[PDB]
Amino acid sequence: VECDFSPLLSGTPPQVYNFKRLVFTNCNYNLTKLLSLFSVNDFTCSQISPAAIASNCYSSLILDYFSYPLSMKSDLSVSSAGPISQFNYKQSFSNPTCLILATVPHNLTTITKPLKYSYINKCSRFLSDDRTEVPQLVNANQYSPCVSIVPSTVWEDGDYYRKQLSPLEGGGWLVASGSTVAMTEQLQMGFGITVQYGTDTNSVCPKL
Ligand SMILES: *[C@@H]1O[C@H](CO)[C@@H](O)[C@H](O)[C@H]1NC(C)=O
Ligand SMILES: *[C@@H]1O[C@H](CO)[C@@H](O)[C@H](O)[C@H]1NC(C)=O
């Protein structure tokens, strides 16, 4: 009857384009209890507040978490053309959402570091003319089209990934490039929260 955030605290977190997603229904949560394990560097919301998201009742609550460098903050903003919002991670524009940037302290030994930070810097599609390039932007609540060809961790910065599509998928080529950022002194993470408001189904409530 309590929301289990355990898989977030055990093992190596994934990369922004392989964000691990936890779904929560019919349970109770202590959100300030979870954030206290971390040094919270950034906390921004949309159509909700950081105070409201901790003290409200939802039909459902979605939690996305990945490894993400604090340096790359502006790339998460939909205002920017940054490769993260375009090709890696996008939260729903319809529902209330929250994005949290935090650092995992040395005490939290159960969370292990990746070798580095990885992200997709370009993901596009070449039309049959083989001259025109159509960017393949990531949709809300979905992974990127290029996740199938981009590895869990990019081996070297500037690596290219291509795939010849079948007429089923439309023909043409699928192109992706990878980029790396050097691992920080302390692992930095990104947490994306999405909540749904129902009518008679608001089962997810704060632990009191
Ligand atoms: C545990 O965290 C505290 C900060 O709350 C820190 O001062 C301490 O060094 C950590 N424990 C160890 C064994 O480093
Ligand atoms: C559980 O949530 C309450 C708010 O409802 C918070 O004040 C408290 O600190 C949380 N529990 C712990 C052990 O921190």
Numbering used by the authors: 381 to 588
What does the publication say?
(d,e) Crystal structure of MERS England1 RBD and effect of critical RBD mutations on binding. RBD residues 506 and 509, identified by mutagenesis analysis, are highlighted in green. Critical RBD residues 532, 535 and 536, identified by structural definition and viral resistance evolution, reduce or eliminate D12 binding (shown in red). ELISA results show that this set of mutations eliminate F11 or D12 binding. Although it also targets the RBD, F11 neutralizes MERS-CoV by a different mechanism than D12. Site-directed mutagenesis and competition-binding studies indicate that F11 makes contact with the RBD on the opposing side of the binding site of D12, at and around residue 509. Binding studies also show that both D12 and F11 can bind to the RBD at the same time, suggesting the potential for additive neutralization effects.
Middle East respiratory syndrome coronavirus (MERS-CoV) has emerged as a highly fatal cause of severe acute respiratory infection. We developed an alternative vaccine regimen, based on full-length S DNA and a truncated S1 subunit glycoprotein, to elicit a broad repertoire of antibodies with diverse mechanisms of viral neutralization, and found that immunization with these constructs protected non-human primates (NHPs) from severe lung disease after intratracheal challenge with MERS-CoV. The England1 strain (GenBank ID: AFY13307) was chosen on the basis of the availability of its sequence and its proximity to a consensus among published sequences, particularly within the RBD. The final round of hybridoma screening generated 45 subclones, four of which (D12, F11, G2 and G4) were selected for additional characterization on the basis of their binding specificity and neutralization potency.
